[PDB]
């Protein structure tokens, strides 16, 4: 009934080696967000970290300059029917 996926994922600020991203929270109790990032340009390992549910921004560091990254966010959220479960992801591309 209610989407648990964040919306309007975007890069709000950037340096050659880092990205400040933000999104709009979904209308559910988010316990934490999981942020993934990896080079868009072949088999290169995707990395992940968590951000608390009250935050709707995150910094990604230690990137390489001039490289395309695929960045995704999904939620670990509480709901009545599923208790703690994971949403689908929202995804963007950004070139440092």
């Amino acid at each position: 009934s209610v989407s648990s996926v964040p919306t309007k994922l975007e890069v709000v600020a950037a340096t050659p080696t880092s990205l400040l991203i933000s999104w709009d929270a979904p209308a559910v109790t988010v316990v934490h967000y999981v942020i993934t990032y990896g080079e868009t340009g072949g088999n290169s390992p995707v990395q992940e970290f968590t951000v608390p549910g009250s935050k709707s921004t995150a910094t990604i560091s230690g990137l390489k300059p001039g490289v395309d990254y695929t960045i995704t966010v999904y939620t670990m959220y509480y709901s009545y029917s599923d208790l703690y479960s994971y949403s689908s992801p929202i995804s963007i591309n950004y070139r440092t």
């Binding site: 209308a27 559910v28 109790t29 549910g53 509480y78 009545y80 208790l83 703690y84």
Partner: protein
């Protein structure tokens, strides 16, 4: 046992009502899920009216009393869904709404029990 049937029939009706109201309405306001709140408030109201009504009608078959209280009100209300909702809010860092949920469920349910009792007592 006849008593067991009262518990199961009343319980099953209450549990079913809670399930329907919770699935339909909880996601409308996730900071204080209103389906879980409404069934606790309603069970509070019914047990209040039962409190007053059974006092004035002492020869009511223990079957109907057991079906209404242990069965319906017991199946309808929940402390466990209430708790996990609060626990989730606490894990999400949402302290203000965790506290608010506890106050609204507890103070609210006591008020409904009082209303149910005093409405019937004032008839």
């Amino acid at each position: 046992i006849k008593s067991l049937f009262a518990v199961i029939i009343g319980g099953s009706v209450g549990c079913t009502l809670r399930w329907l109201l919770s699935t339909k309405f909880n996601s409308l306001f996730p900071n204080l899920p209103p389906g879980t709140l409404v069934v606790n408030l309603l069970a509070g109201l019914i047990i209040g009216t039962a409190l007053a009504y059974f006092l004035r009608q002492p020869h009511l078959d223990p079957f109907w009393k057991l079906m209404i209280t242990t069965g319906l009100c017991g199946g309808l209300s929940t402390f466990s869904t209430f708790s996990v909702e609060v626990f989730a809010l606490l894990q999400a860092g949402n302290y203000i709404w965790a506290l608010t949920s506890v106050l609204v469920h507890v103070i609210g349910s006591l008020i409904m029990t009082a209303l149910g009792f005093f409405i019937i007592t004032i008839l």
